[PDB]
């Protein structure tokens, strides 16, 4: 992507805030999709030893 070494690393391991609307939504389905974002399972660069989790906001 022709980025410099530091910004390229920073962008890949960045934290992204996600929003969920809990109105008329089962808690488990809300929890299932929030769990993967918290663990970082939605990223191809996911690894347990790397703190690649994201922020989940549920209203």
């Amino acid at each position: 992507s022709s980025f410099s070494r530091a910004p390229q690393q920073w962008a890949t391991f960045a934290r992204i805030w996600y929003l969920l609307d809990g109105k008329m939504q089962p808690p488990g389905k809300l929890a299932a999709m929030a769990s993967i974002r918290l663990q970082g399972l939605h990223k191809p660069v996911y690894h347990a030893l790397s703190d690649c989790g994201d922020h989940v906001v549920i209203m």
């Binding site: 992507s1 934290r15 922020h55």
Partner: protein, 286 residues
């Protein structure tokens, strides 16, 4: 007291190793160590690099002015015949001048869009004190160098290295020497970015001047991506738009840094120094 000698002998060698760890001896030149032949090690030097060096030219490449002055001082103390050795000053200038004129030619053909100053810095990088000395110490250049102080100063090591090329210049000619520079100095910028070797200040101020020569309107900086702006870990993707056309996009922790990185992204594309550029062709010339 247990009778035996093998265990006691083996224990003595182990103690010496520990003593060496506690008190490491000062480094000494490879010549002073046993199993050294000045005439033999310099002949294998050509065969190792697969070149037809000339012994008379190659021997004068490792001789330094500091060594000559120090050697004369030793004989004066002992009252000791005259030495006709020639320094590498004449050869180093020939090697240095040819190397820059050959490196400039290679880069000006691979990257025709790069300005003269940009190519000038890259030649100043490959011929730099760090790159040249790193290559020299892995080609047995420091071992064969006749210096006054050990370890050889990096300034002295750089000057001796171009003397070896200078000797190769007369020995095999410029066509064969051009392969020597390509296979040892060009290979020193494989996984390195453009600005990692050509360090600049204010890339945005340099990006504007490049678009003025090409009659391109000034880019506009706008936020394309954003995450965690209010927190301590923000991410911004600032995009440069020339006439409402995206030319580059760069990330950063803050908007000013992300703006700066976007300019560096644009400059690489203008000079053709992107990461996706085709690798240098090391195949034999046709």
């Amino acid at each position: 007291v247990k009778k035996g000698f093998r265990a006691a002998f083996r224990f003595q060698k182990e103690l010496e190793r520990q003593r060496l760890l506690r008190c490491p001896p000062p480094p000494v030149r490879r010549s002073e160590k046993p199993n050294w032949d000045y005439h033999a090690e310099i002949q294998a030097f050509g065969h190792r690099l697969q070149e037809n060096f000339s012994l008379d030219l190659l021997k004068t490449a490792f001789v330094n002015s500091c060594y000559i002055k120090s050697e004369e001082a030793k004989r004066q103390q002992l009252g000791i015949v005259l030495l006709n050795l020639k320094s590498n000053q004449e050869l180093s200038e020939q090697g240095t001048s040819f190397s820059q004129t050959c490196l400039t030619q290679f880069l000006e053909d691979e990257y025709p869009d790069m300005p003269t100053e940009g190519i000038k810095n890259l030649v100043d990088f490959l011929t730099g004190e760090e790159v040249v000395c790193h290559v020299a110490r892995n080609l047995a250049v420091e071992q064969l160098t006749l210096s006054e102080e050990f370890p050889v100063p990096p300034a002295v090591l750089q000057q001796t290295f171009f003397a070896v090329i200078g000797a190769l210049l007369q020995s095999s000619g410029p066509e064969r020497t051009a392969l020597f520079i390509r296979d040892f100095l060009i290979t020193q910028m494989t996984g390195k970015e453009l600005f990692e070797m050509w360090k600049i200040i204010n890339p945005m101020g340099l990006l504007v001047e490049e678009l003025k020569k090409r009659n391109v309107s000034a880019p506009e900086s706008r936020l394309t991506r954003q995450s965690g702006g209010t927190t301590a870990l923000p991410l911004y993707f600032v995009g440069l738009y020339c006439d409402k056309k995206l030319i580059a996009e760069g990330p950063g922790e803050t908007v000013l840094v992300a703006e700066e990185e976007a300019a560096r992204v644009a400059l690489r594309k203008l000079y053709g120094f992107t990461e996706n550029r085709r690798p240098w062709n090391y195949s034999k010339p046709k």
